[model samples]
Target: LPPAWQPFLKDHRISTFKNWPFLEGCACTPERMAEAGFIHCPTENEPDMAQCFFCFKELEGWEPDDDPIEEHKKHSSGCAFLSVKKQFEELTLGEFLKLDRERAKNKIAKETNNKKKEFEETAKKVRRAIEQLAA
Candidate 1:
């Protein structure tokens, strides 16, 4: 995920990849939910799509007169990228710089850690392959 996406996830309290409900729905065989452009709502009869809970509710036409997409448009900044940029704009320059620096450092650290782990795993696989060939 990009640094800009971090705020959206954080604001929504989505802590893990598993928290992305869309991915989970897509993982099911046939990926029916994704094909239908929605995911099953845990509580309501209507399905929960990639959109936020409020958006999902509106889409279901729960309200007799409300239009889902129109309501969504009203909350234009609700979008992940827009929301993040808006948040960035609201922050003081110093605060924004601090956040950017932290995000950059964390991204670098995570990438390096993943690469190291991958290298170790690949080395183990190679050693096993060599041993198997000798046997």
Candidate 2:
């Protein structure tokens, strides 16, 4: 995976359904899900489900004909992993880097929005004090 993708996954989708029970012979096995960029995301409350790695779409309510590829597309048509129809391999690793690089440098500016607001507030106070003193 790209280095940038690693941080994104680490912060978001790298989770597993630790200690969650599944049917002994469920149709949606981990191997099968992996093919569609998905993995079991069992939780204590939610019904048994899978989630895509690249697009991070959690899926449940399966049908007998619910192919991983088909379901992935049904829910998230833009998923590169499902679109390429390959093993869940290079979709996250390839030219997606070129794609990721296109994100503006300030992509996470809102991550520090509090600091920005603080700076603006202080600047306003300073400006007002200076204008009063100059008068």
Candidate 3:
């Protein structure tokens, strides 16, 4: 788990939601999600979203039979870590680096564009209201 994820998973109050939807028997374990480039803990803040650490793709409604790796591919197949399906393991260092760099650019662009859209929406709301800016 990353340092960002530790805070949600380690706290006593946060730990309760930790064991509910995800357990050793479930397919959405931390290890599986990590391998698939998603980070998630079931705290109130996290609720039910499985977000990709790489591409920032958010998916919800997990089931016991759901495989994180498959879901990751199904949704964000272009994820840098998801090169496995495209013979990522066999590519030479130079080729791997190229793919990684490309994936990073693509992902960062999407995230940045998403954030920009969110910011713009907030500003639009602010212009229209004399109340809260946003959540």
lDDT of each: 0.42, 0.56, 0.64
TM-score of 3: 0.56
Residue 38, candidate 3: C-alpha displacement in angstroms? 2.1
- Look at candidate 2 and give me any clashing residue pairs: none
Error of 3 at 24 (Å): 2.7
Could you tell me the lDDT of residue 118 within candidate 2? 94
lDDT of 2 at 14: 28
The predicted structure with the larger lDDT, 1 or 2, is 2
Q: Which should have the higher TM-score, number 1 or number 2?
A: 2
Q: Write the per-residue lDDT of candidate 1 for residues 38-131, one digit (tens) a residue.
A: 2233334544323332122223323323343344456443332223344434777776566566545655665688899999999999999999
1-135, model 2: which lDDT tens digit per residue? 555454233223324444324324755444445566665677656556777655666787665445667777788886555445433344466555544453322344433665899999999999999999998
Q: Which ten residues in a row have the lowest lDDT in candidate 2?
A: 6-15
Q: Estimate each model's TM-score.
A: 0.36, 0.47, 0.56
Task: Report the C-alpha lDDT of model 3 over 66-125, residue by residue, as the tens digit.
Answer: 898899889986676666445434667787567557656776798789899999999988
Q: Which structure among the candidates has the greatest lDDT?
A: 3
Candidate 1 global lDDT: 0.42
C-alpha lDDT of residue 120 in model 2 = 97
Shift in Å, residue 58, candidate 1: 28
RMSD vs true structure, all candidates: 14.4, 9.5, 7.8
Best by TM-score: 3
Please state the error at residue 78 of candidate 1 in Å: 28
